[PDB]
Ligand binder design. Structure first.
Ligand SMILES: Cc1ncc(C[n+]2c([C@](O)(CO)[C@@H](O)[C@H](O)[C@H](O)COP(=O)(O)O)sc(CCOP(=O)(O)OP(=O)(O)O)c2C)c(N)n1
Ligand SMILES: Cc1ncc(C[n+]2c([C@](O)(CO)[C@@H](O)[C@H](O)[C@H](O)COP(=O)(O)O)sc(CCOP(=O)(O)OP(=O)(O)O)c2C)c(N)n1
Ligand SMILES: [Ca+2]
Ligand SMILES: [Ca+2]
Ligand code: NA
Ligand code: NA
Lengths: 620, 620
């Protein structure tokens, strides 16, 4: 469709719109007593032109799948986002004045309780990665005409995650993606490093494969023109702006970031801005081409039961890849992402079978998580991203923000614990249960054999929120029948007798060590009950307690994880105060070191012999 | 000092050295049965030239403060690092064959139990940030002649953290820093994105402010020459290499990352490499100029007691800045780092008083943590880095690796919990206690007033490991006398009576809410004991239990944090099984939202009224 070259009246209306957006940003933040009007004002022309000339969207249906996407990466400019959606007719204008109130959903930074927000922002440097996922989805999955626009701050460009996204977009030729850089010179507490050295921003963008255009970010005409030309590459509109533009005496000054105008000043400034507005008549949004496809919403089911055999040996990391590939044959919604570890996590199996739905994210875990979040928006795909669980610590802020974004993503982290052996602690996940348990929307699966792994993959696919699956390197025996029923929050008793003296809770390699301990102890005429949690969060408190009551109240937890935040603490917190119940923990007490898997389980006190000794100690 | 232009014999000796390093890397990884010989072999000439022509260091004293630093950012090339230190005469050559054994310290990736390792690597993309801290320290603090060399992989350059470090080095004019990029074309599971497009690497480095030189990374002469010219900017030596260089049939091939050669193949290949070596005679290291200054090692003491007054109001975030500035007058070892939040964390106070020892790190928390780790190496400084606690989640992998690095850094995270109010959840730290408690070397301080904050700063300065101080936004009353003695692991009972019915444990704003609850309850003739942990890790289990035993066994924890991994779980895990002890928790159950601080404490069930109701419930 042809560019509509605006006449002077349309240009003036865009200026009038920009100034209305300034006024609202000031009014709202002065009413609240907090917020970031100067960060809004540098972006006012950008916002006016995007929403009232360039973008195509249904103003009354912001989540519509055919719409262009807008991502406010500099989320503290929320008041101007709210203002455009009022200008577009979706929000009531009076509601803007309720910014930041407990009685409003116009919160301090954008959040998905707002129909016009897909991802929460507020932690800087994450929006472009989400936008890349949206754009990748648009070009390669939806195969639709929508475009994706992401507005970033200049201080924000100091985040490495932004540059991961830049690189991703050029690798994947996201010519439906536009990044708008609000180069307003200043950060929060000092000038941004490059200030108004526009040429250096251009060189950095070009070196990362983008088409880069420097503009006057306060010229509505230059913005219309620059946004009106599609390219064959991701495009960076590098906008020279002034922080607090239009606020006389504040424009281009330090000491104003995140400071509202006092009421007396707001009144005077608003009168001046209003004097520049030529007409009250608002521009209307223009609707999109409706070419996004339908997506099915039904539950996704494995095409058959697991086909393992009891006694066969397989590492849960390999079972994950097998199960994910299997699930991919059941539904085209499943996509897989991995950060140059596909041969070790076994997501390569999925790539072999379903290459068009695998996204290689390279060694950039922060961006990988953001891509997944973007791909999941508007329920367009069901993503499974994988790496070593240790390296999900590199993406914790993205995971944290994903929960604030109410995102439905699945994350599988392999190589947990000391049982990986020789690579040593840099590769050992020993804090991932702590990390993922702290994510409020999380479900944490810790499958102990191949059957449980396949069931965890299936359950995760159909579970909302942040699903984490912890996989392991050692080959361990299949212990479950492949028709064993598995559910979130339901544990399994895998060994019992009427004369059990301790309930031992293990998972993954420590479940198998507990079973080996039981065999050692039978020689001493000591029986133990062995319990496999299946999910660490939520925890089957009832079965744990019922088990403990059959074993003299005694629970022993054993885990290939640090003491804090893991299985032992979860269990302790669940049962504390219950009469006659005791909980004893075995876990890894310090940074480990290289050795064979069995040697490290021994050294760190979580193998069969440590378990047996702890049991004997409890009995006496 | 003049470049010594090598003769053909010295060049041949450097080639011979490179080939010896290949042989050792193969031998060691074949002996271990695991490791990354192909990743070693691409770097062999680089390593030979750095260690035996360019660098200046004491071969028998790798930690010597006058030495040039080398950082192996691509840590999986550990076997070649070990091999150079054997070649230099520090390690016994026989020991190289014990790679990855539980009986050896030649672990899978480098770790600081090795004298020649300052920081652990293995999580890719972190070494350059550490190197930047070392170089900044060398140029601006030590004011010494040592240089810093950091070897990176090409896949590794996909990490955003690398680009943060690139930008930092040019901002701070680190002309004593050299990054060597091993552009061997291949990552772990596919070619690296840019493969051998050397010009694009050059453009990216130049756009980020570095002097960039493309070389044949297998030419010892080109390497000598390129390393021999100092510059006025940080310098990137962009080395075109082949993965598995020198291994016939493996060089430049996929499917070989992290795969050792089988013994039959290793023998054949080693014979071929050995046939290329002209002389067995080894080159000797050359020693450094000894111009690094002495650094004092004594305990650092505040110059006077805190000067607060009981009843005065101050936010602990502001007390942190005051206390840090105060401590800076006591010792020149203290340095402060912050990520464009100095006005909000109050580290700006330190910057005002001690500007030469403040490092602005901009909006790049991952790199900030790495800079701090680098600055702490060899005990050259005592760093305190600050941001909002929420944004330390962006740096969790750096923090995790800092503990593996046995680093002594101090981290202060502000803006904890819902009590910040209107900014909303993106800015609210609700998982930081979980995160930092899971770090094995951590001490977690949660000061509840200005006095406790100043004491926490002082204690942290003198405590090894990863020290975290959690600060808060609300002004709360000073409750402690300024001569109150504080110690790690020692809690305080701040309200008691003989007829106390519940021990209520709070911290920060919830300690003050608990005190307000006690006042509400006295009206009902209910007294509660109130306990302030001071440190969450380690936890004063004895005082908690002694308190509980005076209050009918009943403990109530209340925290401005999520349920998992926080104060409630720490307490529960400490006391579980103790006869007659019960623990009830109040915490934040889901992602919050914007409102006034008091409104959010109410909504999320952690204010004075929630506490009072929970207490009444326990009594009945
Ligand atoms: C990952 C990360 N790191 C730092 C920040 C902090 N930050 C931000 C906030 O947290 C807001 O999201 C703070 O402003 C915050 O609201 C106030 O400090 C609270 O003040 P107080 O009254 O509580 O004292 S914004 C910011 C500077 C961004 O500079 P830019 O140049 O990117 O954007 P702009 O010039 O505004 O267009 C910076 C640096 C962030 N949001 N995300
Ligand atoms: C933050 C981060 N992300 C991914 C990695 C993984 N990674 C690594 C390791 O974890 C080693 O540190 C793995 O190799 C690991 O040892 C094996 O996967 C274990 O195999 P398995 O036998 O257990 O199956 S190395 C690596 C590729 C690095 O490619 P580069 O091009 O940077 O270096 P190079 O070509 O080797 O000079 C990549 C991608 C990392 N170390 N750090
Ligand atoms: Ca800015
Ligand atoms: Ca490589
Ligand atoms: Na899911
Ligand atoms: Na310390």
């Amino acid at each position: 469709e042809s560019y509509h070259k605006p006449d002077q009246q349309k240009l003036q209306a865009l200026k009038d719109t920009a100034n209305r957006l300034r006024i609202s940003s000031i009014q709202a933040t002065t009413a609240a007593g907090s917020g970031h009007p100067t960060s809004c004002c540098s972006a006012a022309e950008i916002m006016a032109v995007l929403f009232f000339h360039t973008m195509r969207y249904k103003s009354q249906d912001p989540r519509n799948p055919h719409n262009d996407r807008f991502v406010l990466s500099k989320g503290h400019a929320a008041p101007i986002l709210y203002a455009v959606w009022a200008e577009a007719g979706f929000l009531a204008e009076a509601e803007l004045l309720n910014l930041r109130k407990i009685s409003s959903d116009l919160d301090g930074h954008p959040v998905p309780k707002q129909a016009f927000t897909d991802v929460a922002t507020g932690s800087l440097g994450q929006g472009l990665g989400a936008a890349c996922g949206m754009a990748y989805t648009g070009k390669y999955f939806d195969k639709a005409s929508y475009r994706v626009y992401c507005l970033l701050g200049d201080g924000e460009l100091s985040q490495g995650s932004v540059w991961e996204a830049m690189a991703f977009a050029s690798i994947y030729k996201l010519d439906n993606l536009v990044a708008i850089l609000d180069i307003n010179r200043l950060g929060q507490s000092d000038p941004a490093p490059l200030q108004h050295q526009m040429d250096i921003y251009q060189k950095r963008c070009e070196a990362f494969g983008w088409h880069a255009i420097i503009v006057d970010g306060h010229s509505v005409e230059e913005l219309c023109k620059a946004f009106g030309q599609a390219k064959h590459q991701p495009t960076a509109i590098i906008a020279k702006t002034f922080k607090g533009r239009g606020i006389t005496g504040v424009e281009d000054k330090e000491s104003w970031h995140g400071k509202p105008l006092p009421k007396n000043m707001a009144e005077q400034i608003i009168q001046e801005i209003y004097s520049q507005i030529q007409s009250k008549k608002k521009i209307l949004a223009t609707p999109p081409q409706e070419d996004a496809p339908s997506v099915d919403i039904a539950n996704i089911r494995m095409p058959s039961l697991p086909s393992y055999k009891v006694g066969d040996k397989i590492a849960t990391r390999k079972a994950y890849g097998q199960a994910l590939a299997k699930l991919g044959h059941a539904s085209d919604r499943i996509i897989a992402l991995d950060g140059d570890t596909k041969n070790s996590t076994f997501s390569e199996i999925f790539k072999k079978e379903h290459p068009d739905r695998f996204i290689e994210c390279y060694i950039a875990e922060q961006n990988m998580v953001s891509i997944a979040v973007g791909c999941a928006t508007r329920n367009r795909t069901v993503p499974f991203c994988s790496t070593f669980a240790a390296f999900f610590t590199r993406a914790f802020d993205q995971i944290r923000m994903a929960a604030i974004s109410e995102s439905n993503i699945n994350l599988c982290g392999s190589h947990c614990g000391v049982s990986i052996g020789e690579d040593g602690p840099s590769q050992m996940a020993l804090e991932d249960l702590a990390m993922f348990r702290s994510v409020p929307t999380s479900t944490v699966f810790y499958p102990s054999d191949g059957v449980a792994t396949e069931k965890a993959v299936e359950l995760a696919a159909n579970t909302k929120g942040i699903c984490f699956i912890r996989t392991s390197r050692p080959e361990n025996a299949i212990i479950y029948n492949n028709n064993e029923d598995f559910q979130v929050g339901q544990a399994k008793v895998v060994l019992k007798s009427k004369d059990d003296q301790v309930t031992v809770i293990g998972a993954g390699v420590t479940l198998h060590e507990a079973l080996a301990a039981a065999e050692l102890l039978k020689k001493e005429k000591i029986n133990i009950r062995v319990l496999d949690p299946f999910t660490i969060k939520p925890l089957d408190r009832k079965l744990i307690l019922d088990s403990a009551r059959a074993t003299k109240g005694r629970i022993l937890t054993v885990e290939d994880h640090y003491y804090e935040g893991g299985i032992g603490e979860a269990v302790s917190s669940a049962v504390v105060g219950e009469p006659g119940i005791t909980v004893t923990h075995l876990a890894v007490n310090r940074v480990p070191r290289s050795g064979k898997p069995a040697e490290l389980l021994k050294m760190f006190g979580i193998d069969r012999d440590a378990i047996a000794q702890a049991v004997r100690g409890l009995i006496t």
